[model samples]
Target chain A: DTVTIKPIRAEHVESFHRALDAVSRERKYLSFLEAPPLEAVRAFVLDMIENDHPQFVAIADGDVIGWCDIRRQDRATRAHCGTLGMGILPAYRNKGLGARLMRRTLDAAHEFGLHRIELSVHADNARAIALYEKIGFAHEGRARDAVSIDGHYIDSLNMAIIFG
Target chain B: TVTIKPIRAEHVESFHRALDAVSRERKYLSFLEAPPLEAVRAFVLDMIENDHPQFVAIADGDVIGWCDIRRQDRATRAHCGTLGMGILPAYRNKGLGARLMRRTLDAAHEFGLHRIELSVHADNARAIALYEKIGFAHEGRARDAVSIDGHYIDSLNMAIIFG
Candidate 1:
């Protein structure tokens, strides 16, 4: 099966929420602690769209399966950088969809005129970490006690790739 | 004599003066030039009224250093908040920053925050040292993230866990 990665469109909002809801239930990935409400996701996606934030989605069998977006800070000085969040469906895991999404995202970064792009991942996610490392993101720092899951505090690594 | 406590409307005037004094260092503190009193007042009011934790160090009844944590807006991110700290130039390395972190982290815990994070200029070894000593480790680094006086400075994102 071929996975098509493309920019997020207005019509994809509902399907995007579906993917978010499904992937969030897994709990092992994503920054959202719990499955976010559809209303909240609508507001967030609307804001991202309004601000022209670059978003990409991977489609397989005609359904949105993975999503990623880069958010630039509103501050003038920090506008050159964008923080990214991405996730894939459980069934779609390890099929190279993540890498495909990332590659497409970097393409969008260039179009968005971004200089520094970054993201954080749970310290325990070796597979995702390895993928980011292989894709040229430099390991910058570890934030201890950055997240809480199952009452256990977990750390996260900050990583980014810079372009002149 | 110095005292550490929560900030209020009464401190904005002195806080404005302090910001004016610190802005001379050409820090992008949002701007190379100091923002006007009204702007600072708006910032002061927002922090004072919000659920987030904010505190200041007053030396002999004058504002010297201010520290505050901004909550992350996402629901899952609610447990963590971004931290920021600033000390008057003269108060640098005088232990006021460490004091602010200690007091502010206490307040953050009281507010039910699980963790705190901050970003610093990579070239700012002094502040970086203080953050590390106070128990924050580097989380990530964004290259050429800060632009001051036409030169670029990398920013190191760091954070800590509050008990």
Candidate 2:
């Protein structure tokens, strides 16, 4: 009954990739180009870690079970808001990992001084959609046929929460 | 007597001027503050020298508004591009936007793009109406997606697809 959450580090790089790759293999969510090279992921990781963008990995048995982050959009006009996303290994499902990571990182958002957080989801992800809704994210809009995989087109729902 | 044409090197100086004029209002672009002219110069130079599709609106031979589509450089997302446009304040209430949009789309076809997208603040009803009129459909939104002067405003994303 132990859950540890902390900021990501250089040492956590490989574990993070393993967790992300495990989820990426399920092909259910996430926008991963097949076999995303380690250097690419590591390079992106190093930037966020070095720059102090809000990011964290949740550990269960010393493994990265889930990871979450809020990335500033890099435009002065848009930097006040951060796009948030998370992934959990399929085996770790229903462990409240989603909520844990979400709440934990949202606190970081306040600390980051961001006024809002945004996220997009595959329309059919009811579990995630419910968590987002319960945590006070409202369904703002939808984009059609944004992704194509295995000859199946999917719609993505955009959602966000504004800090008062 | 306004014309729309592919932007050229000669236009960068004027384009930089025009963007600075518009940026002063701080309502149309993502720059919370006017970006340094050097940043603007690089943007214009890249668009002009590259194959990126960019069109200029000329009224009396002055650059008033510009419409450009930035094709996603990533291989997997190459089918899509992001659309951006702006008009000088004096050019308001004219058909220039629709004209610029038409011209830009023509160039988009030449570039073999499948879709183009753009985002605006939720409060920008006029711009949204123009995009919708030009067949850009609401794709998605991020609530309170913009912050200016301590006020949060949602941002809307729109797209138009073409074969």
Candidate 3:
């Protein structure tokens, strides 16, 4: 099966939310919050469409199976850097969709005149950590006690990729 | 005798002056490297009346220190909050910092936060000891994590877990 990455459209919002809801429920430990409400989903997708930041959906078999977005932190001094947040449906896991989404996101970030991209990954998610390192994101810092799940505190590593 | 409370609109200018004094050595472990005066003013003003719980320590009708327990807005992460505390240099070693921290944690717990986390500069032994004394445990270290002025500084990550 071929997986295609394309700009997310308003019509794709519901499917995107459905995909994210499943992913979030399956990997609640990785996500900061639970699946958002419908209103939040609408607002999020609308912002993606209206804002300068780029959002993309990964389609497979005519379904939006995964999504990713790159956002510039609103601080004027740090506008040159874009932060990346992403999620993939569990059905699409281990199929290399994450890497494809990241590559496309990096390209979009560069197009926005960003010199660097950053993300925070759970310290315990070795698979995601390895993928991030392999894709050139350097370990920058750690936000300790970034979250608590199942009565344990989890740290998140701040990673960044800088362009020359 | 006067009591200190959450920041109000009238305290804006004095808070800016206090922030300027605190930032002189840039001794704090803040997200911003060196906040410009305008940025400092705007931040203090914006956060003064914020719904997120924050505390300011005042003595004799003057604001001497401030601490914040900002709730995590992320839906899945709402149980956690980040902690930040700063006191004027003249007020150091007076036990006031510890008092402020204790109050901050109490308020955060009241708000139903499960954990509070803070980052400290690696070289700040005093602050680290204080946090440890107040139940915050050393969680991790970021080596050569931040670049300020012309040098890179390390940061120690710490957190206090609460039910």
Q: In candidate 2, what are the lDDT values of residues A1-164, reduced to their tens digit?
A: 68788988888888888888888777777766443677887998899987788899998888888999999888767788788978888777787878888888999898888888888888888898998997889888886666555656577788888877
TM-score, first chain, each model = 0.92, 0.94, 0.92
Model 1 C-alpha lDDT per residue in residues A1-164, reported as the tens digit of each score: 88899888777878888898887777776777565677787787788778778889898888899998888866666778889888888888887788889888887887878888888889999989988998788887787777666677777788888875
Clashing pairs in 3: A33-B76
Chain A TM-score (model 3): 0.92
Please state the CAPRI-style docking class of candidate 2. medium
Identify the runs in model 1 with alpha carbons over 4 angstroms from their true place: B20-24, B28-52, B59-62, B71-81, B109-115, B132-140, B159-163
True contacts kept of each: 0.67, 0.61, 0.28
**Estimated TM-score per prediction?**
0.83, 0.87, 0.73
What DockQ does model 3 achieve? 0.27
Per-model C-alpha lDDT, please?
0.81, 0.81, 0.75
Q: What is candidate 3's lDDT per residue for A1-164, written digit by digit as tens?
A: 88899888888888888887877776554464457887799897898688768788999888889888888766443456677888887778877888989888888879877776777788888888888888888887676667666666677788878766
lDDT score, residue A48, model 2? 94
Interface RMSD of each: 2.5, 2.3, 4.6
lDDT of 1 by residue, B113-136 (tens): 888888788877888889889888
Winner on lDDT (2 vs 3): 2
Off by over 4 Å in 3: A27-29, A140-145, A149-158, B1-53, B89-95, B109-112, B120-156
Between candidates 2 and 3, the TM-score winner? 2
Candidate 1 lDDT at B114 equals 82
The weakest ten consecutive residues by lDDT in model 3 chain A span A26-35
